[PDB]
Amino acid sequence: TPEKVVNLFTFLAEEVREILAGLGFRSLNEVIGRTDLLHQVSRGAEHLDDLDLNPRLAQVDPGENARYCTLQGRNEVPDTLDARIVADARPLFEEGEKMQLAYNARNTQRAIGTRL
């Protein structure tokens, strides 16, 4: 039943809200990348395992950029030949009539005829 999955996700979100409120922040953005809030504790003085998690606790300083994605939309790519074709075969998309085009191809033109 979908209600089951909805309830599971709701409980999982409420737990994260509780934990964030207990720490002292008000958003998941304020906690992304903040490694200094994590400490390592040993199991005890009877196991004597020398695990040092510091290699994963290392905090590189970002600089003037933020610690997460700060851009909208996808990463755009340069335009191929197809653009020109879309400029020419307009009666096909406006009326639905047969067309016939000719061009020149070069090996630096990838995905010839995919956007169409």
């Binding site: 009666p91 047969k98 016939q100 085009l101 000719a102 061009y103 070069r106």
Partner: protein
């Protein structure tokens, strides 16, 4: 056209070579056509002229595309009275396929053809 008479623009060999080049779709035969047309004695004013530039040649692949040039031609008006409806229709269909313009000429036009097939 006669053997003893003057020279004309459209002779038999020219017509046959053009029709062959356009029926088989072979560019070499069209080049033969152009060679056979542009080598006769001067018959018009534009035969006494010569093209002579001074810049250096460029590769052909950098010249503007075909369609951008084909959209500069048309077919002049030829009324449906003179031509058969078959030829008029074939001209109008063939020109609307490459993006260029065709003509209607005098003598009106069949209204039923105001919509595509």
């Amino acid at each position: 056209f006669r053997k003893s008479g003057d020279r004309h623009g459209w002779e038999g060999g020219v017509i046959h070579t053009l029709q062959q080049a356009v029926t088989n779709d072979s560019y070499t035969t069209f080049k033969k056509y152009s060679e056979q047309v542009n080598k006769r004695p001067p018959m018009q004013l534009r035969d006494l002229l010569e093209l002579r530039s001074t810049k250096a040649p460029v590769p052909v692949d950098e010249v503007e595309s075909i369609t951008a040039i084909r959209k500069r031609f048309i077919t002049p008006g030829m009324s449906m009275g003179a031509l058969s409806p078959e030829a008029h229709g074939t001209l109008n269909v063939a020109m609307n396929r490459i993006g260029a313009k065709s003509d209607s000429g005098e003598g009106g036009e069949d209204p039923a053809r105001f919509r595509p097939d």
